[PDB]
Design a protein around this nucleic acid. Structure first.
Length: 51
DNA sequence: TGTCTTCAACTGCTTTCGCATGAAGTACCTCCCAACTACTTTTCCTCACACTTG
């Protein structure tokens, strides 16, 4: 009945410590935001909000 | 003596990335707690009978 996981469960499945914190990670110096159109910028630029 | 064949039980996975917002188990046990009522507690107060008198 929901037995605390051991190191084998800790390392595998969807997570696989390898998959959730090694093959992909959170990163610093990053932001996420809803994108808004704008034709006046270059086609190679990105409009960054002053925040 | 030696090699071969099918079935059923067992293994591991089968969208990604984030918000929310975290909450909730529970038997067995209880000692603690809050209660109503009664009972008990500490200081204080005030009167009273007998022998004897004449």
């Amino acid at each position: 009945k929901v037995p605390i996981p051991g190191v084998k469960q800790a390392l595998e499945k969807k997570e696989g410590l390898f998959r959730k914190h090694m093959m992909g990670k959170r990163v610093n110096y990053a932001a996420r935001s809803v994108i808004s159109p704008d034709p006046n910028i270059e086609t190679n630029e990105i409009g960054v909000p002053p925040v």
